[PDB]
Design a protein around this ligand. Structure first.
Ligand SMILES: *[C@H]1[C@H](C#N)C(=O)[C@@H](C)[C@@H]2CCc3cnc(Nc4ccccc4)nc3[C@@]12C
Ligand SMILES: *[C@H]1[C@H](C#N)C(=O)[C@@H](C)[C@@H]2CCc3cnc(Nc4ccccc4)nc3[C@@]12C
Ligand SMILES: [Ca+2]
Ligand SMILES: [Ca+2]
Lengths: 417, 417
């Protein structure tokens, strides 16, 4: 008998990750879980065919069903526009989804005992809470073709005043300019999510900004966090012998590098992007990271594989050549989404399944069965031999076999007791 | 006999670094070198007294004399305004100087064989070329008090057109907004400095941007670098078997973490700030880093101690307590400035002196004589005993003694040959 999984929004993606996504569903999910799956194809060709409407439709479906699982997608540049003959250079679908849902993206390494860290001191996890809204991801940027003034203005909705600031008077030649923004309510939601994560883990929290330079913009994040801490969380932190402190971003990246881990790090949108990749690589592998958007309603989540679409492997796959691609981040997008679905529905069987699949994934790699990219972490890519790893299909089949075993034994444990 | 040093602009700074700066001049520079020193006091109290004009005057003096050496300064926040009863919350003096001079700030770790790295793979140096102009450091940021529209506009100097872009329509509540810019000529100068640094070292060059998100703003940096590479440097790189490649910033920080070092990394202003601190800490210590602004004229430099003013030690010093503060980055600001002064003046004696003082500094620490902060790198701060390190004065005297020896022996080597 299969587990009744409930409603899940899935977003199909691109290139190698698109192939792996289908293998995960076929081999690891569908044989055990029956889902009311709302499928949106976010492949670059379908986003082009729908003028990117499919991306907005998927985000609206997540608001409705409360759980989304997303495959890695291409954010097209000039080369991609030429490759696919795109109508427009479509904006990041992750940016589109995040700006519709809002919230905080929590990112953490997926640790295997036999995969070495690059930062030896990191014995405890570092969890980044990346503010998912605004800043560079909803900016208006443009080329300044020549001499002239760039100004930024604010006009209150009543129409009773107008403030105009000179950004720059280009006196000789041109350049570039941009405007960006953030919202008080979004920053407040980011603060609440960060304080709640720290209390859930029993770890201290650090917020990074550059408020000495962006005195008003970054000063606002610092002020909102401090006001919310003082009024709503300080006694809770004190009860757990933890603390909250603001840090300048450049001091914070050095503090993190020198640390033993074991803290929550609240990052603005851009820093969360950069620093989560630095941290994932520091723990051993860029591809071994979870990424879950927690929305402000405290009910909606979107789990994703945050890494690239592995174009190099896709080109090999297109030529009918053997590939060996790490599917773990894509599997954990499904297990994190299904664990939330289970929490919302009080579904014990689904919660057990989601945790079991995470355990199987880690146990498989720790038993020495892994893809080429993971074998390269241990030995170095030029030293990897074909006898050191499993191809994509072989690895998925090994996970499938280990999953069947874990679930079979647990089923037998019930009937006995 | 003393070395005729020539003209140097010095900028005095704040707190503990201000005390160390005077010790360096008194013990290591003035007994050996006679300088035409143009002194500017950039202490927070003097910047307040002159309404920050001293900072602009110092930058103009560097343009005139071509060499500046700068002590670490305070960039005041709300707490500093209260502490010193400041007239205004003065902007970063580093930002003011850099935006007047322009150029690229080259940053690299100062390596000691007995100071352990936190990233074991980094066996070769990583040099960051941080674009010194514009972006967040010359931004216009403000609080949005409530609902209303933020717009950004461009008006060419002829007055024949006006382009207006909506940044955001705040429908409920307020937030923050900002405008920033960069200049084509400054980006071109940054590109030239980066390509020239890579060729000087015989190492590949990487530029990081987020052009998939800021398609026009970051796309411009990517385009200018590629055009300059193709037209002016590609054959030179090919002759040295090196290369230039653009990378997305989040991919680049992971690539750097996983690397063995040995490359030049061109960073936009904000990334150069953050990533140079991450890299300095990765090599072993935040305080062990050189930082030299190379201006576009190919004649002017400003060397600085890029770390903080060590307020914790200054508070101990104010209470008449013993302190042990690492002066190495402040010494290397002087040696890097004096080495450039020597290059401009074809002054062999000064060039020898600047290199000798760098050698003495590293040899002293490698012989096991160091400050508490460096002893903490080896043993861990809670494990450091007073028998493991020298106080500030003791360390400066040890450096002074070793410098006297190095210079005495070299003087004797001439007279013999
Ligand atoms: C994987 C590949 C195989 N099989 C190779 O033979 C190399 C050519 C190839 C280099 C580029 C590359 C990039 N990324 C991955 N794996 C990965 C990274 C991040 C997330 C998931 C997977 N693997 C490769 C290989 C090593
Ligand atoms: C230095 C100090 C001494 N002596 C102590 O006893 C500690 C209280 C103090 C903690 C804070 C601190 C910060 N920075 C430094 N050194 C430094 C850093 C960067 C550049 C130059 C110097 N040292 C301390 C000590 C360890
Ligand atoms: Ca990323
Ligand atoms: Ca810095």
């Amino acid at each position: 008998k299969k587990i009744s999984g409930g409603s899940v929004v899935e977003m199909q993606g691109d290139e190698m990750t698109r192939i792996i996504w289908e293998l995960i569903k076929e081999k690891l999910i569908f044989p055990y879980v029956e889902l009311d799956l709302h499928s949106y194809d976010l492949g670059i060709e379908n986003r082009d065919a729908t003028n990117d409407q499919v991306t907005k439709d998927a985000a609206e479906a997540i608001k409705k069903h409360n759980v989304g699982v997303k495959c890695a997608t291409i954010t097209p540049d000039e080369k991609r526009v030429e490759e696919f003959k795109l109508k427009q250079m479509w904006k990041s679908p992750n940016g589109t989804i995040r700006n519709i849902l809002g919230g905080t993206v929590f990112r953490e390494a997926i640790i295997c005992k036999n995969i070495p860290r690059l930062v030896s001191g990191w014995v405890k996890p570092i969890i980044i809470g990346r503010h998912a809204y605004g800043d560079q991801y909803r900016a208006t940027d443009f080329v300044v073709p020549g001499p002239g003034k760039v100004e930024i203005t604010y006009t209150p909705s009543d129409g009773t005043q107008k403030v105009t600031y000179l950004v720059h008077n280009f006196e000789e030649g041109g350049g570039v300019a941009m405007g960006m923004y953030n919202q008080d309510k979004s920053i407040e939601d980011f603060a609440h999510s960060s304080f709640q994560m720290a209390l859930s883990k029993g770890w201290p929290l650090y917020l990074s900004t550059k408020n000495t330079i962006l005195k008003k913009y970054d000063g606002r994040f610092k002020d909102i966090f401090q006001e919310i801490y003082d009024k709503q969380y300080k006694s809770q932190f004190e009860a757990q012998k933890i603390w909250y402190e603001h840090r300048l971003i450049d001091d914070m990246v050095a503090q993190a590098m020198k640390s033993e881990g074991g803290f929550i790090w609240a990052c603005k949108n851009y820093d969360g992007d950069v620093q989560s990749d630095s941290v994932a690589q520091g723990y051993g592998s860029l591809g071994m990271m979870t990424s879950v958007l927690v929305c402000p309603d405290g009910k909606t989540v979107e789990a994703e594989a945050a890494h690239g679409t592995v174009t190099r492997h896709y080109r090999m796959y297109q030529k009918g050549q053997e590939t060996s691609t790490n599917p773990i981040a894509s599997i954990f997008a499904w297990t994190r989404g299904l664990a939330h679905r289970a929490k919302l529905d009080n579904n014990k069987e689904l919660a057990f399944f989601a945790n079991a699949l995470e355990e199987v994934s880690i146990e498989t790699i720790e038993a020495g069965f892994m893809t080429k990219d993971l074998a390269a972490c241990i030995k170095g890519l030029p030293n990897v031999q074909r006898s050191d790893y499993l191809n994509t299909f072989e690895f998925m089949d090994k996970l499938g076999e280990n999953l069947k075993i874990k679930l079979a034994q647990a089923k037998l444990s019930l009937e006995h007791h």
